[PDB]
């Protein structure tokens, strides 16, 4: 752009006026708000700032330069691109083990901004072998360094399309297993988010989270004083129970069911929602796991949410109950319990406000309840299905056949099959 003698003194060989200029740029880029990154970029000072991060540059020069480049990288994607194109990332990484503690926090912050920009830059940071120096930071004690490193670590684990290199990010699991025992709240939060990202994938990824003894602590963190800790911990727990029955049983054995019960009455609506989603994944298991959910007294608050909670939460409670109802074939007492807890009317009432998908989910639940009813009255020699009466007395029999008006060709068959078979 324009600057002399602030760019020239930046290009000076005098180490003092090199620092004085860099500090000026840093103070400018440290946005109270809204900071003039573009005019700093077009001033052509970025490549020089990158030079100041070289191995044997003065410490305070490395610090101020990395700080300045950090804020430039915190801007738009195009502004972050400028830092990347200046080959600054490999120097950020080198400072993670060469620089002092203060310099390390600057560098790891910058890498967080770069990795948080896109999946491309996230992968690029990983391709530059950043993981090993980053994991080395957690050998340090300074809380502020640990806090920032954990944040950057979560940024490297985040993203699904595409997901990061598993062979790389999975190396952070033993470190994350320790980080969730931290006394620092913000460190806890980001560590739990990082785990939720890693636990989101195939059974191999889930098993890796299990093998480092993480689930036990996650369940304990569900009762943390802060909802900022509970939410990512719940997300991670919810991800693990998306695996097979064995992996789901581990979470149950860690005492997740009583914890989930308390979360059903959480002030945060989305915590309620994902608690129901988690339970629904567990009720989605085998007979004994559905029974465990029942024995943990989870159904009554679920039924209560199925009728009075917001739709996004209500639809998740539907999944939980609808799943559990499927189990009623192998154990009819499951259906008997569900019906006795008054689930039929909230299910039926949901049919007239739900999505095309949730209605289909609800219809399967009601069908499982009905199918159990006929199986029982046939084996006991009765003339009337009381579950069919319960539905009719709840006024849902009509709602069942107010769903064939619906133009989806398969909300259509079950709806009238129910009416044709039971009514």
């Amino acid at each position: 752009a324009e600057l002399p003698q602030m760019t020239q003194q930046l290009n000076s060989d005098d180490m003092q006026e090199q620092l004085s200029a860099t500090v000026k740029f840093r103070q400018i880029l440290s946005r109270e708000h809204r900071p003039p990154i573009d005019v700093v970029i077009q001033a052509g000072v970025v490549p020089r700032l990158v030079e100041f991060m070289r191995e044997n540059q003065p410490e305070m020069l490395q610090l101020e330069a990395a700080w300045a480049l950090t804020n430039i990288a915190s801007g738009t994607s195009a502004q972050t691109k400028v830092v990347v194109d200046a080959d600054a990332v490999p120097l950020f990484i080198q400072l993670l083990y060469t620089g002092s503690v203060e310099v390390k926090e600057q560098a790891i912050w910058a890498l967080g901004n770069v990795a948080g920009d896109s999946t491309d830059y996230r992968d690029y940071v990983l391709q530059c072998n950043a993981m090993e120096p980053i994991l080395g930071l957690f050998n340090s004690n300074k809380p502020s360094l640990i806090r920032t490193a954990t944040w950057t670590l979560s940024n490297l684990c985040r993203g699904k399309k595409p997901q990061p290199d598993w062979s790389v990010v999975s190396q952070a699991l033993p470190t994350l297993a320790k980080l969730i025992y931290s006394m620092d709240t913000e460190t806890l939060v980001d560590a739990c988010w990082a785990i939720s990202y890693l636990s989101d994938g195939p059974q191999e990824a889930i098993q890796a989270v299990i093998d480092v003894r993480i689930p036990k602590r996650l369940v304990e963190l569900l009762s943390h004083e802060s909802t900022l800790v509970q939410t990512p911990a719940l997300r991670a727990v919810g991800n693990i129970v998306t695996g097979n029955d064995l992996q789901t049983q581990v979470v149950i054995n860690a005492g997740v069911l009583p914890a989930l019960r308390l979360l059903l009455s959480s002030p945060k609506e989305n915590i309620k929602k994902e608690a129901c989603w988690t339970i629904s994944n567990i009720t989605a298991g085998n007979t004994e796991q559905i029974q465990a959910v029942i024995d943990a007294n989870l159904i009554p608050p679920l039924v209560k949410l199925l009728e009075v909670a917001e739709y996004k939460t209500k639809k998740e409670a539907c999944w939980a109950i609808s799943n559990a109802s499927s189990g009623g074939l192998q154990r009819p007492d499951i259906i008997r319990y569900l019906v006795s807890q008054g689930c039929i009317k909230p299910l039926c009432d949901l049919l007239e406000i739900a999505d095309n998908r949730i209605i289909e989910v609800t219809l399967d639940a009601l069908e499982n309840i009905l199918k159990m009813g006929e199986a029982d009255k046939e084996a006991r020699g009765l003339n009337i299905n009381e579950n069919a009466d319960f539905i009719e007395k709840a006024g849902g029999m009509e709602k069942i056949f107010n769903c064939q008006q619906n133009e989806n060709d398969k909300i259509y068959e079950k709806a009238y099959k129910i009416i044709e078979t039971y009514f």
């Binding site: 109270e32 804020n71 912050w109 948080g116 944040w151 629904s280 989605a284 949730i358």
Partner: peptide, 18 residues
């Protein structure tokens, strides 16, 4: 039962103001 659902139906960039 019938499932599982991987999904139910943090802060990308930060500035250093010290």
């Amino acid at each position: 039962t019938r499932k599982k659902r991987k999904d139910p139906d943090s802060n990308s960039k930060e500035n250093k103001i010290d």
